[PDB]
Structure 1
């Protein structure tokens, strides 16, 4: 009656970590990305699969789902198959690329667009979703200059912990209102503000650019501890540095104001993803 072609050729490993591996693969002549989960990270496969079984997200700034596959061995093998973005992660891309005003805005507005789509409840639709591990390694760069948000393995739907370097103060001081879905959107907005700082540093103005650095590179070690982060973010209330050169450039001046309004200690004071979008559409 019909052939179901399920073979995926694994061509090259583009990522290896505690999570497992990501591979460029081929299905029927077409590139796909294949995430092979470690035993350590099986719950991330279950959570993303449960979310996509609930709502088939389709958005230009969300990594495109193709399949969740569980295969029996004499162990269980868990694969997540998605769209493949050959330019790789935003983290990767910013190491070896500076930006002009148009490319910087296009990147950050595309991320805000993806994030607002996750956050919003649509009736008749989708449940509201918080990502809970937003960071530059979880954003991919598309050939058209927009990005897409990846990895919903920690996501929570309305209707474990994130990466410590990107944790909001209420996560680090354990005051987060855990019974309140809006709390998790506000944790994402904090992390978005850090990503906006990472990108803005790489935007050239008046012949000046900053080197790529991760948030808090100047105040915490590599693989900072929970306490290292708590001391910086909660006790001392430090925030990433805004260089003087930004204040000569109208775009970077506007982006500095936006990132400050993602970093309020009081989570309810932070901008919403929809307000960030609107502000970004009025810049330049």
Structure 2
């Protein structure tokens, strides 16, 4: 691998810890990084580290590198999972990014359903706002996420939402429409029709996915189209079906979901617009229920 001193961390400054997840991407572990900031060389920072599995191919390496390189280019934002450093020399590739201690947004919402304190309506709108803000930043850097969903939003110790996995390499022509998430759900349920049917990914199709994520927020981690298999989903979308309004959701916020699901991509709102609308809605939202 080519040396890049902008990002290199000596690997004896990385104390590897417990796993966070394994799969086709390799494996991710929690870790402690000693002297990340050159200012404080005696401070440890909890971080997450991605590395390759043992039986990993030359393409597997190339995908991890392009993911690291994409993060380098995109730059930093409060509401995305930021690259912190890399271990690339004399050993296995380690890609180091911010650690979000409260896990993904789907799990976080589900743990706070009434029978870990319940979320106020302002907490929920503010969650949406922060995700929209991350996507606004990513879109401004010309980044199309392609798999925006609550499972790909991570929550920090301080309840900050961070978009994850915006830099993954995907061959969209090799998507397995039938492949489930570890949770048993079908990622096709977050795709715009023009991405699902025609493989056309845009900022406008990420806005479609954001609408689904909004629905996940206000159902507190609900599963979209529960029990609906791929073939029937295709039919629903061909017919123009749209998910029902969640209970505990204003008509204004449901109108936002429906606009994100506009049949015509050019007529959906932009993330810039959604940020402005959500900002207005946060201010007007009662944190008393």
User: Shorter-chain TM-score: which interval?
Assistant: 0.7 to 0.9
Asked if 1:200 is matched to 2:203, the reply is: no
| Consecutive unaligned residues in structure 1, runs of 5 or more | 121-126, 177-182, 203-211
Provide the residue aligned with 2:11 in structure 1: 6
TM superposition score normalised by structure 2: 0.75
Residue in structure 1 matched with residue 182 of structure 2 by the alignment: none
Change (3 A) 1:33 1:186: same
Following TM superposition, by how much is the alpha carbon of 1:154 offset from its aligned partner in structure 2, in angstroms? 3.6
The 8 Å contact of residues 130 and 155 in structure 1, kept in 2 or not, is answered as: no
Q: In structure 2, what is the equivalent of residue 213 of structure 1?
A: 222
2: CA distance between counterparts of 1:169 and 1:219?
16
Q: CA 1:82–1:192 in 2, change beyond 3 Å: closer, same or farther?
A: same
- How many residues align structurally? 242
Deviations 1:24-59 (A, max 9, x none): 11111220111224537545423322323434x111
1:142 aligns with 2:142: no
Q: Which residue of 1 aligns with 2:126?
A: 106
CA contact (8 A) 2:72 2:83 kept: no
SS of the counterpart of 2:165?
A: coil
Identify the match of residue 97 of structure 1 among 81, 100, 112.
Answer: 112
SS of the aligned residue for 2:51 comes to strand
**Equivalent pair of 2:20/2:29 in contact (CA under 8 Å):** yes
Q: How does 1:249-260 map to 2 (within 5 A)?
A: 252-260=250-258
Deviations 1:49-104 (A, max 9, x none): 2323434x11110112112444666xxx4432101111011122122113211210
Change (3 A) 1:174 1:42: farther
1:45 aligns with 2:64: yes
The 5 A counterparts of 1:100-179 are 100-120=120-140, 127-154=141-168, 160-161=171-172, 163-174=187-198, 176=200
CA separation of 1:61/1:270 partners in 2, compared to 1, >3 Å: closer, same or farther? same
Alignment of structure 1 residues 72-83 onto 2, 5 Å: 77-83=92-98
Gaps of 5+ in 2: 1-8, 35-43, 114-118, 176-186, 285-289
User: 1:256-271 alignment to 2 at 5 Å?
Assistant: 256-271=254-269
Aligned CA-pair RMSD: 2.4
2-structure distance, mates of 1:131, 1:91: 18
Conserved 8 A contact 1:138-1:149: yes
Question: Matches of 1:213 and 1:255 in 2, distance apart?
Answer: 16
Q: Structure 1 length as normaliser, TM-score?
A: 0.76
> Does residue 33 of the first structure (1) align with residue 48 of the second (2)?
yes
Judge conservation of contact 2:204–2:265 (CA < 8 Å) in 1. yes
